[PDB]
Structure formats: C-alpha cells, structure tokens
Design a protein around this ligand. Sequence first.
Ligand SMILES: CCCCCCCCCCCCCC(=O)OC[C@H](COP(=O)([O-])O)OC(=O)CCCCCCCCCCCCC
Ligand SMILES: CCCCCCCC/C=C/CCCCCCCC(=O)OC[C@H](O)CO
Ligand SMILES: CCCCCCCC/C=C\CCCCCCCC(=O)OC[C@H](O)CO
Ligand code: NA
Ligand code: NA
Ligand code: NA
Ligand code: NA
Ligand code: NA
Ligand code: NA
Ligand code: NA
Lengths: 337, 335
Amino acid sequence: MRLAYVKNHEIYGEKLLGLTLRERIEKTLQRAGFDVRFFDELSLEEAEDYLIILEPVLILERDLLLEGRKILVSDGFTVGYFFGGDFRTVFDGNLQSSIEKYLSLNNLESYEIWAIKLSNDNLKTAEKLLLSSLISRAAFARITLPLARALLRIGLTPDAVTIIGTTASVAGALVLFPMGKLFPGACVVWFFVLFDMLDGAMARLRSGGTRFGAVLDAACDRISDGAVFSGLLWWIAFGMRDRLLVVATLTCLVTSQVISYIKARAEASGLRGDGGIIERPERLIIVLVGAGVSDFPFIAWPPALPVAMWVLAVASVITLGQRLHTVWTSPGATDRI
Amino acid sequence: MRLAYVKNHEIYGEKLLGLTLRERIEKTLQRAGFDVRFFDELSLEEAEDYLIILEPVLILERDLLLEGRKILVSDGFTVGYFFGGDFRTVFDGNLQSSIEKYLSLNNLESYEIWAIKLSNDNLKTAEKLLLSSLIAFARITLPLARALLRIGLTPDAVTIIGTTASVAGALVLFPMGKLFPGACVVWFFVLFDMLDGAMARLRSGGTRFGAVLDAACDRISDGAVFSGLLWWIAFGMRDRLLVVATLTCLVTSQVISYIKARAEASGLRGDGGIIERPERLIIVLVGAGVSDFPFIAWPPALPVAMWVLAVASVITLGQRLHTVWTSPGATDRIP
Ligand SMILES: CCCCCCCCCCCCCC(=O)OC[C@H](COP(=O)([O-])O)OC(=O)CCCCCCCCCCCCC
Ligand SMILES: CCCCCCCC/C=C/CCCCCCCC(=O)OC[C@H](O)CO
Ligand SMILES: CCCCCCCC/C=C\CCCCCCCC(=O)OC[C@H](O)CO
Ligand code: NA
Ligand code: NA
Ligand code: NA
Ligand code: NA
Ligand code: NA
Ligand code: NA
Ligand code: NA
C-alpha cells in the first residue's frame, strides 16, 4: 500500500556504526510502514502512497508519520517527496518534469524531518548526529515551525509573542480562576503557555535569538506561574474558603519560584542547578489537570484540585532539595573564594 | 619543586576561626608554591628548595616570596629556614646540627615576615591578630561570628538556621495576627542569616554554593513573610483588596530577584530598581509593626506600606528588565 522508492547512491554502501547506510535507511523506512524499493531508473508500481528519496540521506527520526502531499526537507535541502498514488497518472518517465508538473497540479506542504544529507565530507557529523538521535523534539520542531513561520510573516517578533502569550495567560488565570471557572481557565492558560513557547522557533527562523529574549522568556515564565497560582489561591481562599488547601497553594507558589531561582542563580555563579522530579512542564500539567478535572463539565471530580495541589507541594519541596544537591555536586561548588 | 617541612605539633589541631592551624599554615604555604609535608623525624625528599618550620607558627601574610637562602624571622623569633636543595647533602639525620652546619657553610639574610609563634597561652592573642589580619560591624558582627565559629558552626549552617528561624517567626506569629512580634523576630533573624558573610570572611572566604544557598534562602524568607502576612490579611482582616496588593508584592519580590539571577546567568546585568530587598523588608515590616504596635496601634500603616510596596515593586520589575535590555550584548543575535 505504501511504497518508498529510494534512489541508489554511492555513499549508501558506506558503513556507519556497524551497519551500512543502505540497510539503515531501509529498516528506518520499513519501520514507518513502507515497502522499500531501491532504484536507478524509476518504475512506479501501483500504490496508495509514494515516498521518493533522491538525495543520499541518513534519517535520524525513529517514528516517521507521513500524510497528505509533502516535500520532505532537512536544513534547507530537499530530501524527498511524499506523493499520492495519483502521481502515477502524471509520471511520464522523466522524473524532474513529472515532479514539477505534480507540484504545479497539487497543494503540497513542507515536512521538516530530522535527517542529514550524506556526503563524502560530513560522515563524522552523521556519526555524531546518529549518537545524539539515539540519546519528541523533532515532532516539536515539525509542529512549531509552520506556526512560527506564519507568525513571523504577519509581522510578529519572538519577544512580542512571548509578551502576548504571557499577558494572555495571566489574564486568563486572574480573570477565570477567581470567579471559579477552573476548566476554561485551565484551557486558556495551557493554550497561551504553548503560544508563549513559540518564540524559540521564531528566533530560530530569524537565524538567531538574543540573550535579552531568553531572559525575558524565563522571567515571563515566572510571572505566568505566579499568576496561575495566585488565581487558584484566590478561588481556594475566597471561593471555597479552604485554609488547608491555601497552605498547599502558597507552598506551591513559593517553591515553584524558588525552584526556578535556584537554577538561575547557580548558573550565574557558574554552577549547575537543574534536575528534580517536577520541572515547569510537569508542574503546569499537574496543577492544570487538577483544576480542569475539578471543574470538568457534567462529571467534575472536585477532589482532583486538592490531590494535585498536595502532591505538587510535596513534589516541589523534594525538587527544591534535589536542585540544591545539584548545586552542591557541581564542580567548584565548595571551592574557597 | 619546593618542599615545606613543617614539624608536627599538637596545637596545630586547634581551630582558630573555624579552621585548624595545621590546615591554615598548609594552605598559606601552598599559596607560596610549596608542597607541604608534616613530620616528626625528618626524611629529606629530593627538592630544589626547602622551607623548614620547627616551632608551631601562624603565618599572617598572604603573599610570601622566597627566592634565595634565608632565615625567616618575626619580632626576633626565628620562624623558619629557607635553604637550597644542597641542604640534602648536609643533612645527617640530626636536624638541629645539620641546620647549624648549613648556616655555618652559607651566608643568609634575615627575612622579616609577619607571623606569630603559637603556644597554649597565647591562642586568644593569635586569634585576635588573625582577625586583624583578615579585616558597630567590628564590635558586634565580628565577635558574634567568632563565637559562632568557636562552637563548631559554619557559615552555611548559620544561613540555614537564620532562614529557618525567620520563616518560623513569619509563619507562626503573622497568621495569628501578632504582627509586631513577628516583625521583630523576622528582622532579628534576617540579620542572623546575614552573619554568614562575616563567618565566611573569617574562615576560607566562602563558596559559590554558599552564595547560591544564601540567596535562595533569601527568596524563601521573603516568600514566608508575605505568605504569613497574606494569611492574616485574608482570614483575619478579611481584606481582599489588600490581598491583591500582598500577592503582587509576593510574586514581584520573587520575580525581581529572578530577573537579576537569570540575566547574570546569561552574562548580562539585572540589578537596580527603586525598592531593593532591604528597602522592601523595611517597608513591609514597619507597616505590619505600626499596625500592631503596643498600646496605640495605627491600623492604616499595613495597607499603605503594602500598596506603596506593590506600586514600588511593579516599577522595579520594569527597571531591571530595562537594565537587561540595556546590558552590553543583550540584543546581539546568537547565530
Ligand atoms: C495585579 C493584577 C490585578 C488585576 C486583577 C484582574 C481581575 C479582574 C476581575 C475579574 C473578575 C473576578 C471576579 C471575582 O470574583 O473577584 C474579584 C477580585 C477583586 O474584587 P474584590 O473582592 O477585591 O473586591 O478580583 C481579583 O482579586 C483578582 C485576583 C488577582 C490578584 C493577584 C495579582 C497577582 C499578580 C501576579 C503577578 C503580577 C505581574 C507583575
Ligand atoms: C493607600 C492605602 C490607603 C488605606 C486606607 C486605610 C484603609 C482601611 C484600613 C484597613 C486596615 C484594617 C484595619 C483593622 C485591622 C488592623 C490590621 C492589623 O494589623 O491587625 C492586628 C490585630 O491583631 C487585629 O486585631
Ligand atoms: C515557605 C512558604 C510557604 C508557607 C506558607 C504557609 C502559610 C500558612 C501558615 C500558617 C497559617 C497558620 C494559621 C494560624 C491560625 C489562623 C488565624 C486566623 O486567621 O483566624 C481567623 C479567624 O478564624 C476569624 O477571624
Ligand atoms: Na516565550
Ligand atoms: Na530579542
Ligand atoms: Na515564557
Ligand atoms: Na476553611
Ligand atoms: Na545567610
Ligand atoms: Na560557603
Ligand atoms: Na539568606
């Protein structure tokens, strides 16, 4: 049903980390559900999908999801094409002319794949990238990049997007949470936290960000977390009138601020301060899911808000210790000044 | 290589200002480029220079430069000997006679250094002289630091103790409405946490970890102060507008410090602002204390201090950000 036509190249005969690039790309495409056909002159068997790979490439993605009609790209180089079966009606023997005709007749999008075009002079980089791949950031890039392109094209800048997302998140948190609309507040806050995350991709498309932009993005993270926790606290203290839960919420707020501060300050002194069980994404998911479940339409479970807040509280205290341990074990930490 | 042979003594195990005299003289001589070897009977390893210290001594000089053949002295007392490697050819097992022979065979000059020969009955004077060497503040802060070091405390321990005591004061006294005693306790133990700097100066000089810990504990103390105040304001006073002002103060106090830390982590500046941590603490603590002052408390001091602080904090939040924006290299593109 799915055929992957790979053009034979000289470098696919080279070995890399025990296996040849030929078998490597073959198994990679087979994992993606493709039947692999190497070729020198293209003969289009009847299929529903065609993945045609013309340049020699090492694919660095484990899970490859291809749909629609796309041009696969990698660092600006056009790796291959993902066409429908209808391309057989346009393929007239001359591959370049058929490809150009098909691109003129159809709507195609670009598909940024984590891969590297193989040449005689970059195989060491291919080895390094394969090791990096073996340890989804690639799927994150493949989703964020078109949105970043669109936002840049309508005149937005990465820092502007940071401020927009942070302002919308604080507005949602401080408006919807105090009046008890925990589920729509959780949705709005999550949407605009994801929105604020786009500034990095936008700066990558501008061939570079700035240090001020990074500092602004992080300080805005702190502002947004403070606002989420403050709006939840307002609801818990004055809506629910729950003193124990206020204790948990104040603990969550202060500890999340200090957890981020430890990493920042350790790096300011030239040390490490990262780590911990609960970082910002897990922290936001636990509190927002707890708030959303507590106000879910029709079948809300109100105890989800306290359970999330208490678990996070303990999970934050522990993290605060863990990061301190990181600072304590960083080289030069106990060095005398 | 140059070897410093120090004769072992019981008194080198005594601690002065947190560190032992053995470790103190060891680090001092290592700063001078010597490999330090403690001994009771001398075995001369091969070296280019020999620094022989026989009496127990505290060296009070930071920069010691030894080049020729010399006799180190201090106020008439012979501190040590600086001989060449050729002393290995004259050492016959008995150190005093070999030293006298080497002195008879060579011409040496007396190098007057700043040191003190240690005895059991002058350790207090030696500690006072060491304190003079390492550095009101002098009458109150330094003796308190010396006392805290003497009972085995270290700077990081005092940081944690002072922060824990201030957090306890804030979280016990403020929520039940005891704003004046809470302000007193918090101020006292913030000063206590500040004693960590003097203790580090008296010891090695402090660590990067210590600096990071002191600052993170500052953040914890500020969070606890504002949280106890918020508890009282929300459930004791039932004043919601003042609660928004207090939440603004809390969040902004965390974020203001985070900006500076994060900018410095990026190699930029982030300090400044109209209201810094000492001013913030003075404002909120004075407002709470005046609001709960004994006999004739003035209730409006708490809200005025908070709202000012809120307005003063938000502005500060911008200023530091502007500082980051104007730091050299801030807006440079990173390829
Ligand atoms: C500084 C931001 C303040 C602007 C807040 C905007 C809220 C608009 C009102 C939205 C509808 C909420 C209705 C409601 O039930 O609560 C009203 C409440 C104020 O009313 P009152 O009870 O104080 O009279 O409303 C509130 O109390 C809002 C609670 C949020 C207060 C916490 C502010 C913390 C700021 C976070 C960091 C700031 C960035 C520098
Ligand atoms: C610009 C700001 C202008 C503000 C103008 C004043 C507004 C009204 C003041 C209310 C404070 C509450 C008054 C009564 C509560 C006293 C607060 C307090 O500290 O109480 C301690 C004591 O334990 C309690 O019994
Ligand atoms: C580390 C920073 C995060 C820690 C955050 C912890 C905040 C909660 C701590 C103590 C509250 C103690 C409550 C003491 C009793 C309440 C007094 C009260 O307000 O009672 C009002 C009364 O019911 C009608 O006027
Ligand atoms: Na951002
Ligand atoms: Na920027
Ligand atoms: Na951000
Ligand atoms: Na209650
Ligand atoms: Na301290
Ligand atoms: Na230290
Ligand atoms: Na401190």
